[PDB]
Amino acid sequence: LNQTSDLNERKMLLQAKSLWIDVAHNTDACKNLENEISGIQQKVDEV
């Protein structure tokens, strides 16, 4: 029961941190895409 409890705690913590890492790399990809947006926007401004 205690073994199962700590295993459930570790599993839910791993799931939470996995969702966090997923949204973190998604935010990193969207930030790279926003930097590309800024580059293309500077190109649009020069045009």
Short mmCIF file of N, CA, C and O in Angstrom, two decimals, residues 29-43:
data_model
loop_
_atom_site.label_atom_id
_atom_site.label_comp_id
_atom_site.label_asym_id
_atom_site.label_seq_id
_atom_site.Cartn_x
_atom_site.Cartn_y
_atom_site.Cartn_z
N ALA A 29 9.62 25.88 -29.59
CA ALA A 29 9.38 25.86 -31.03
C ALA A 29 8.60 27.10 -31.47
O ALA A 29 8.91 27.70 -32.50
N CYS A 30 7.60 27.50 -30.69
CA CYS A 30 6.83 28.69 -31.05
C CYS A 30 7.66 29.96 -30.89
O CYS A 30 7.45 30.92 -31.63
N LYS A 31 8.62 29.97 -29.97
CA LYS A 31 9.50 31.12 -29.84
C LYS A 31 10.49 31.19 -30.99
O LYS A 31 10.80 32.29 -31.48
N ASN A 32 11.00 30.04 -31.44
CA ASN A 32 11.82 30.03 -32.64
C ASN A 32 11.02 30.49 -33.86
O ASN A 32 11.52 31.23 -34.71
N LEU A 33 9.76 30.06 -33.94
CA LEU A 33 8.90 30.50 -35.04
C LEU A 33 8.58 31.98 -34.94
O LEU A 33 8.43 32.66 -35.96
N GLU A 34 8.50 32.52 -33.72
CA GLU A 34 8.30 33.96 -33.55
C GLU A 34 9.56 34.75 -33.90
O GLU A 34 9.46 35.87 -34.41
N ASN A 35 10.74 34.18 -33.64
CA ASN A 35 11.97 34.81 -34.11
C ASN A 35 12.04 34.81 -35.63
O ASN A 35 12.47 35.80 -36.24
N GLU A 36 11.61 33.72 -36.26
CA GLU A 36 11.50 33.70 -37.71
C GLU A 36 10.47 34.71 -38.20
O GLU A 36 10.65 35.35 -39.24
N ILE A 37 9.38 34.88 -37.44
CA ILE A 37 8.38 35.89 -37.76
C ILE A 37 9.00 37.28 -37.71
O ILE A 37 8.74 38.12 -38.57
N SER A 38 9.82 37.54 -36.69
CA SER A 38 10.49 38.83 -36.59
C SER A 38 11.46 39.05 -37.74
O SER A 38 11.57 40.16 -38.26
N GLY A 39 12.17 38.00 -38.14
CA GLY A 39 13.07 38.12 -39.29
C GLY A 39 12.33 38.44 -40.57
O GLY A 39 12.70 39.35 -41.32
N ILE A 40 11.26 37.68 -40.85
CA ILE A 40 10.45 37.94 -42.04
C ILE A 40 9.75 39.29 -41.94
O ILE A 40 9.50 39.93 -42.96
N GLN A 41 9.47 39.77 -40.73
CA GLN A 41 8.86 41.08 -40.57
C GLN A 41 9.86 42.19 -40.84
O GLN A 41 9.50 43.23 -41.40
N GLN A 42 11.12 42.00 -40.44
CA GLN A 42 12.16 42.94 -40.83
C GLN A 42 12.37 42.93 -42.34
O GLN A 42 12.60 43.98 -42.94
N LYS A 43 12.28 41.75 -42.96
CA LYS A 43 12.33 41.68 -44.42
C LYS A 43 11.16 42.42 -45.05
O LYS A 43 11.32 43.12 -46.06
#
